[PDB]
Amino acid sequence: NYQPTPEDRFTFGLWTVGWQGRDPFGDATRRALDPVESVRRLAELGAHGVTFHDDDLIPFGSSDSEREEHVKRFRQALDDTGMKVPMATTNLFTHPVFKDGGFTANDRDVRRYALRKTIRNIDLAVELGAETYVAWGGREGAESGGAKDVRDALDRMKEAFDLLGEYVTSQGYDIRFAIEPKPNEPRGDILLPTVGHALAFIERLERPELYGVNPEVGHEQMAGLNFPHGIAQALWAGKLFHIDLNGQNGIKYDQDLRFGAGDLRAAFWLVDLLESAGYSGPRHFDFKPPRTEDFDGVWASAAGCMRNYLILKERAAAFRADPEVQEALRASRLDELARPTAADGLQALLDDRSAFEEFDVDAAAARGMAFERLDQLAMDHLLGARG
Amino acid sequence: NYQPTPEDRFTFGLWTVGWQGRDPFGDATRRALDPVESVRRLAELGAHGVTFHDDDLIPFGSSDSEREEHVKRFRQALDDTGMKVPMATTNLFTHPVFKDGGFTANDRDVRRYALRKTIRNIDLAVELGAETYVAWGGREGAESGGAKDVRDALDRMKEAFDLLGEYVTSQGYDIRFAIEPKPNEPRGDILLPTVGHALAFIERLERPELYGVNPEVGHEQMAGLNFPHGIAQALWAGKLFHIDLNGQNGIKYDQDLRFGAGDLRAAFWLVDLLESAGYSGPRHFDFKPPRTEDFDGVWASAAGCMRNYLILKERAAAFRADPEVQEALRASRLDELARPTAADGLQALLDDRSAFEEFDVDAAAARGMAFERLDQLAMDHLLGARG
Amino acid sequence: NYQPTPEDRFTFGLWTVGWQGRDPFGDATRRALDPVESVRRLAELGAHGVTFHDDDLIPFGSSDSEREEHVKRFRQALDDTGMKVPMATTNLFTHPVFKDGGFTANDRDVRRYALRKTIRNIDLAVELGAETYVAWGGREGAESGGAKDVRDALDRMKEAFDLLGEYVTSQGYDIRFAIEPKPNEPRGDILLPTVGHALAFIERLERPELYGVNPEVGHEQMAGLNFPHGIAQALWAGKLFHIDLNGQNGIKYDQDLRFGAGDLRAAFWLVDLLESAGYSGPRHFDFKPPRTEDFDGVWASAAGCMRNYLILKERAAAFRADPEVQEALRASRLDELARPTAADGLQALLDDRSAFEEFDVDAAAARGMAFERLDQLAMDHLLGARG
Amino acid sequence: NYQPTPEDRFTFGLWTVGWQGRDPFGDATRRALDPVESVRRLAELGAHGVTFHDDDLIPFGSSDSEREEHVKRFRQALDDTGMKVPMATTNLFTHPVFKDGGFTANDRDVRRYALRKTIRNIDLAVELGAETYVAWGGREGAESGGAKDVRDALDRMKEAFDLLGEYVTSQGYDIRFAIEPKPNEPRGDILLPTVGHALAFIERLERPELYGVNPEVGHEQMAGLNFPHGIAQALWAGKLFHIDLNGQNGIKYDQDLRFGAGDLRAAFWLVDLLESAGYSGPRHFDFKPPRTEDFDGVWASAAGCMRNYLILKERAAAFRADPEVQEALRASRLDELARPTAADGLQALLDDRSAFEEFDVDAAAARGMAFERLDQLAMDHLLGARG
Ligand SMILES: [Mg+2]
Ligand SMILES: [Mg+2]
Ligand SMILES: [Mg+2]
Ligand SMILES: [Mg+2]
Ligand SMILES: [Mn+2]
Ligand SMILES: [Mn+2]
Ligand SMILES: [Mn+2]
Ligand SMILES: [Mn+2]
Structure with missing residues (x-):
């Protein structure tokens, strides 16, 4: 009952079920998963595909030979399971070099490094068949007022995204960009904090047609905003390229609960909108199984994401047909x-x-x-x- | 010490010092002010100008005869004091006919009425020399998910603003529009809830150059957002046409405290940004003297708005000169x-x-x-x- | 299906279905209800009883003869319908005299007046059979830091509640007090802002056994707190005398939506707790039918409150028995x-x-x-x- | 100018200046500090004393042999600098065994272990001359409604604190306990979430006189509450045993900014209250130098905590003397x-x-x-x- 199938287009990041439970106040509670085990377990639950940061798959600072062996194992697991890779992204937030940002770091050499790290992973994303490249600027921002001139930083952000549009155009890649907004955490304030700010920023890029948004349920709710309303504005502008589904209990730290948890009525109205608009992209879960759970709870949490979407889809269709x-x-x-x-x-x-x-x-x-x-x-x- | 002059361009809405103190839980604590008296008291305090809703100046339902007497008295008061009218706006939120909105009411006849009411006041605003026309869609939005299809509502909002832009260009008026965002209150959620959402919406209008934003300090802070950062993005986009200055203590009902109150360091960084960017428009206070105050406290609170701006201006200048x-x-x-x-x-x-x-x-x-x-x-x- | 009966102990304030829709930005959208019509309509929907402020029933400043005629009509309506009056309360917030508070007003004569107004309505509550007297100190607080010494104000608040405990003890009244917390609105901050602060304050009263709490769903959620957790702490302390049920969408103005709306999963866990703890007090709805509604929507909203409780009660029992x-x-x-x-x-x-x-x-x-x-x-x- | 002296009673946790910069999305940006070096650097800046978790001082798992060397070095550093240890606390949140809590873990053996770990460090705290023992139950609480029966959890929390009070009284120790509230993070909701909830809980302990609160500026502000008001209620109740000073920008993740940052006027009113009430305890900073900083920035941020207190103290004194x-x-x-x-x-x-x-x-x-x-x-x- 309410069984997911690959046609439902449910996707998961390697870092979601792979999260080891390290939080700001505690050490890891679970060991690391091999990406190959993740792909196989998710296929058996009915998922459609997986997504990844470069650093999820390729240890930071891996040699090129070392990079090749990591891709080849992931490779084979996708081939064996029929799992797709519809989206990929860059980790520009974990390594200490990114402590003041990647694209808008004050230091010019860090900004150039971030662009080069991103461009390398675009190549890999395209090789694996990705159609969407997500950017979450998690370190782009400030804790204090003087640390960042936001007009200068937006110049630097536009420059980075324009250069990336140049690269994919020059290579002839069939891939689009999606900006993932978040209002805060881990920075005190993050640039482009909501869906609206990201949509406005895209209109000043050199080729806006290449860029859309990847809104996340919990991130808009972290600003107290109505997530279905924001998704409606993204659809109205023709800019909903991808979506991150999870749960969030109001205005606090980014919880990333499984979809369905948090604000249940907002989840209902979101599914009603996506299905009646005929949204055909991936239904991606950017969530974290709570660190109370062992690995059997990890897969139960992931299955729950998919089940709750299917239940809400049924109730929304019954509502509209009554x-x-x-x-x-x-x-x-x-x-x-x-x-x-x-x-x-x-x-x-x-x-x-x-x-x-x-x-x-x-x-x-x-x-x-x-x-x-x-x-x-x-x-x-x-x-x-x-x- | 820290004395305002008309050269500082401080402006106030009639409805600010004229607020009688009625809140959701209480009756009025102050008698209504005659607009002519407000203009004279504000001039005595060093203000540059005043702003108005149509219904602040002309009692709703006024005959075309009575409407003329009201404007004549007001024009005379303006002339006697010098005082300017840099901006005007429409009340599309008080009368019960607007309980589901003006431009995005589900009922088409209400939407046509809201447009006609607005167009009449654009004519009056231009005759009084206003350069900016503000729209705060306080009733556009919803309490429940099924009451408003937001994609249709955005079509209707665009239709309304395109028609207004057609009107002003056909008449040869040299006035510009400024959308004032707010995330909630009095509706559960209000459409175009932040500076970013309004900036994005403007880019889809037929004549986007005619439209900018009128951000308010407290409204962005009602979503927990960094107001100076949002102002920076408006400046970066060339869209800061006007600004509403006041104070707000975090995420709660819209307090409209005098400027300087609420979040003091954000006020400092705001004044630093405005002055360093060379913002040339009005410094407009959209505030409410608390209902604990008599008329002496009303004027003390208005004086405080101006004084706090001037102190912060001095300290930001000293900071940047050091x-x-x-x-x-x-x-x-x-x-x-x-x-x-x-x-x-x-x-x-x-x-x-x-x-x-x-x-x-x-x-x-x-x-x-x-x-x-x-x-x-x-x-x-x-x-x-x-x- | 899911039909309320008087045994479910559902109660409504006269001011809930009686709310005329006047909000901080708009005039009334509905005419006033006669309390007699409210009692009859609520009886036919299956309600158990009604509650009232003195000023809901008795026009402010009514003469004693005038007071008697108002009570006698309400009187007869209760007799005819079998409706009970389990709770009553005092309006110490609407009249301008209470703009700085009732019990903690800075002016001593206002504090004495507030006590006398409260004591008169205790007499009436007891005559009508009320077992609980609620106090919501909506004007007790401040917008600014220097306006209120909170240690002195808590002394004044303790003094008021001690005097009220003296009165009911001297009269031999079988009635208990319940403090209704709210963190803010209409004051910038309200004293005793959460369930926890109220519980702590009660322990310093001269006879704490006479005092409990009347927590409201939306008020705790206005602070981002977990309402079922707070109810559990009130039950643990033996202090849940009464409860206000409604809905609230996170941290913003006090919405008072119908119960079930707002945070639906919190509503589920609340009903699970109340039923499994055997809470036997009234299930009181302190809600406001949105001002978009005509009177037929008012009664639909009230019926919805009762229906949603009954649905959640069924699902919680099925959950625990599975x-x-x-x-x-x-x-x-x-x-x-x-x-x-x-x-x-x-x-x-x-x-x-x-x-x-x-x-x-x-x-x-x-x-x-x-x-x-x-x-x-x-x-x-x-x-x-x-x- | 505005120079701290030991007479000002400024104290710092080892874990504050010793924070290596690991957050939920990023690895450490600074190397670990030797506790002896922190004590000496803090003394050079004018601090009065230092505080510690057991695991800050003694690496977890240390043999009874290794534990003695660690304390000896530290005692010697204290003697050389003068520096005091006014308070100590237990880490019951980092190790994965505490993922569901310490005192309120569902597993009884974890609860017994948490008590034994705490009692060992009480002995050490007393030997070092601490007068206050702080408990922050950072892992007590839940992400989901059915995971924790809060009434049973409060029974277990009371059982834990009653046993601790039995221990200290049986040994003749002259130490008092201070509960540090926090509303959320790292758990979705934390038990005893505000100053009021903890004050209420203390009154149900067997020996309530042994227990008070350790409120933190940022934690109450994470619920949107007025921190000076909450401090006033703690003072009114005779329960302000200790205080944690820092900065926070509204309702979001726990920022732990240096004191003065965040909400500046609330810091002013806080210092006015503490100094006018004659609070005699430590002025303790529970803050984290941002991970953008090198060790020079660590010490600059700590100096700033003290300096901002001293400026505010001067201005509040001038205010009250005027x-x-x-x-x-x-x-x-x-x-x-x-x-x-x-x-x-x-x-x-x-x-x-x-x-x-x-x-x-x-x-x-x-x-x-x-x-x-x-x-x-x-x-x-x-x-x-x-x-
Ligand atoms: Mg995401
Ligand atoms: Mg405004
Ligand atoms: Mg209530
Ligand atoms: Mg602390
Ligand atoms: Mn997230
Ligand atoms: Mn406002
Ligand atoms: Mn309410
Ligand atoms: Mn903290």
Whole structure:
């Protein structure tokens, strides 16, 4: 019941089920997984593919011969299981050299190094069949006001992304970029902190068509924002290239709980939106099995991610197909929201006495919106109190 | 000492000092102010100008006869004091007809009425010499997920702003629009909730050059965001058309405290940024004197807004003029942040062996950033524990 | 299906369904309800009783004859419907005289007035059969640091509550007090901001046995706290006298959505706790039907409060009775949490080599807690994915 | 200028300046410090003393032989510099055995081990002259609702603290316990999450006089609470045994910035309260120099903690000494707040017609509170815009 299949396009980062449980206050509680074991276990649970940072697969500072042997094992595991690699990314945050950032580090030589590290892994991503390259600028930011001139840093960030668009264009690579926003942690404030800031930044790049967003449930909620609303704005702009699914309990540290946990009604409205919009990209889980768990709990947590999506997908479809919800949407005038305000045009609007001179504002004000019934129907469907 | 003059460009909304103290849990504590009296008292305090909603100046429902008397009195008060009207805006949130929004109400007739109400006040704003027209969509949004399809709502919001841009260009008006974001309150979630979301939305308008942002200190802080960082991104995009200054203590209801209150160091870094970037627009206070105050406290609170700006301006200037701070900025490599990462081009960067193959990452990782020394110098300057 | 009955002990404040929709930015959207109509409508929906502020029932400044006629109508409506009045409270926040507080107003004469207003309504509460008297100190606090010496204010707050305990003891009234915490709004910070602060304060009253807490879902969540955890601490201390149920979407203004909305999984764990602890007080909804709604939406919202509680009660009971959840609780050692750590006593613990000298910390560390399976079983039960 | 001396009682944890910079997303940026070197560097900066976790001083797993050498070296360093050890604490959060807690772990054998580990370090703390023993239950709590029955967990926490109180009283030790609250991180929710919750819990211990709180600036601010207000309630209850000073920017991960950073006006009001109440304990800094810094920045950040305290102390003293501020305090009736509301008794209050029957509420409502003038004087004093 609610069994995931590869057609559901569920993907996992190597670093998700691979997380050893080291947090700001504690040591690791689990040993490291071989990426090959991760690929095989995830295939048996019904996953579609896996994603990776360069440093998840290739030990930092590996020689080229040493790099080749690491890829070849991962290689074979993907071949054996039919697992795809739809997305890859760069670790520009763990090594101490990135303590003030990669692309916007104050030191110029670190910025050049970060670009070279990124470009090497783009090559590898394309070889493995990745269609999306994610950038999470986790160290781009500041703890204090004078440490970072944000106008200069945005110049440096634009320069880096423009150079990367140049590289893939010169190589003829069929790959797009997705910026993953986060408001804070591990920096006090991170540049491009929300979906909105990232969307605005993309419009100033030299070729904006190459760049989209990879929003994460928990990151927008870390700013108290409505995640389905932000996803709707990304869809409206044509910029939802990828998505990170997990759970988060409000405004605190980045929890990365399994999808479904955290804010359950936001999860319901998110799945309703993705499915009714026909989003066809990967459903990627950027989550961390809590460090209380042994490895059997790791795979239970990963399976739970996939199961909760499938349950919510079923309830959202039942909600939209219910004839009673039908009528309630018409009663709340959702179909009128979808109609133009003034397709007659500006001149006609200015000459329409019914729009102002003779508009009965008191009668219009008395009309109820009937939102609370509509919402209780949605609650009933989520909880299985109707079908 | 720290006395404002009209040259400082301090402006205030009629609705700020005119707030009667009604909050969700309590009735008014102050009598209503005559707009003419506000203009005169504000001029006596050293203000540069005043701003208004249509309904602050002209009582809602006023006959075309009564509307003319109200503007005449106000124009006369402006002339007698000198005082300017740099910006105006529409009240699309108080009357019950707007309970589901103005531009994005589900009911089409409400949406047409909201546009007609706005266009009438654009005409009045231009006659009074306003250069900026502000839109705060306080009722655009939702409490529940099914009540608003956000993709349709963004279509309607774009339709509204495109029509307004058509109107002003057809009349030859030399006015620009500024969107004022806010994440929530009075709606559970408000559309375009942060500076970034509004900046992104503007790029999809038909004539994006006509539109910028009017960010408010407290509104970005209601999402836990760094207001100076968000202002920097607006400046970087060429979109800071106007600014609302006030105070806010973190993530809670919108407090609208006087400027300087709330987060004091963020106010310092904001004034440093505005003054160093050469922002030339109004320094506008969107604040509410607390309802504990009588009219003497109203005027004391308004004077405090201006005074705190002027103190912070002095300390930020002293900070940037200090040779020891200039040293510390070079020690933290802020000057290198301003340097192109790779003006030598993509190919040169790829061939530069010093950027990767022979980059000593451990030596680079060992470099201290000297940020804490720089920040304590900024502390000392703010507190006047050095000159 | 999921039909409320008076035995479920659901209660509503007159001010909940009576809320006219006036918020900080908008006028009322609904006319006022006669308390008699409220009592009759709520009885037909299956409610158990109603609660009131003095000012909900008796217009402020009513004469004694005028007071008598208002009570007599309410009176008869309760008699006709069998509705109970289990709780009442005082409005010490709406009138401008309370702008700096009631019990902790700086002005001594206002503090005496607040006590006299409270004592009059205690008499009325007892006449109507109330067993709990709630105090929400909504104006007790400050916007600025110097306005309120909190040690002096806590002295004044203790003095007020001690005097009230004296009054009911002298009159022989069978009634208890419950303090309703809230962290902020309408004051910048409110004294006793959380359940914990209120519990601590009660221990310094002259007769602590007379005082408990009335926690509200949304208020604890306004501080980002775990509401079920706080309710557990109140139960542990023997202090849960009353509870306010509603919904809240994280850290923002006090939304007072209908119960079930906001944080749905917290609602599930709250009902699980209340039912398994055998809480026998009223299930009181302190909520506000959104101002988008007409009166038919008001009653739909109120019915939804009751329905969601009953659905969650069913899912929580099914969760606890599931033999698979059974085993999972034993697998996660919840029964071991309920056993003493050292019932053998201090001397035996100090002499137990297995507790330290010979404890195998590495073997103990390797044990998984199996929390993620347990939690996915709970998710499955909430969503009706198992029975 | 603003130079610390041992008389100022500034103390630092070994783990503060000794933090190597490991965060959830990054490896260490600094080498480990020898405790003897920290003691000497801190003494050179003007510190009064140092504090420690057992595992900061003695490497975990040390033989009883190796443990003695470590303490001897440290005692010698203390003697050479003078330096005191006013408080000590137990690390019950780093080792993986504590992944579900120490005192409230579901596994009983872990709970017994946590007690034995703590009791060993109490003996060491007393030998080094510590007067306060701090407990931060960083791992007590949960990520999911069913993992922890909080009522049983509070039974186990009380059992643990009662046993510790039995131990110290049986040995004749003259040490007191201080509970350090925190709302979340590293657990999703931590038990006893705020100052109020811990104060309430203490009153249910067997010997409550032995236990107080160790509040931390950033931890209360992680719940959006007013830290000076919470300190005032701890003082009012006689329970402020110790304090942790640092900086935090609002509701996010625990930043542990140096004191003065974060919320600057709250730091001012905190220092005003501590100094005016005559708090005599240590001024302890629980902070982390940012991982961007080298060892020069570590020491600069520590010096900044002390310097910012001393600047704020001067400005708060000037504020309270200013005759114009004393005037403003009387104008705001702070002196009347300090007056008993009804020292004449319940019966006299009931018979006082001036308190209700003849109280002119509209005249009282008209009184301005003059809070904004008072607060701007406090501003001026903090910024040194008056003397
Ligand atoms: Mg992510
Ligand atoms: Mg504003
Ligand atoms: Mg309530
Ligand atoms: Mg601490
Ligand atoms: Mn995350
Ligand atoms: Mn505002
Ligand atoms: Mn509430
Ligand atoms: Mn901390």
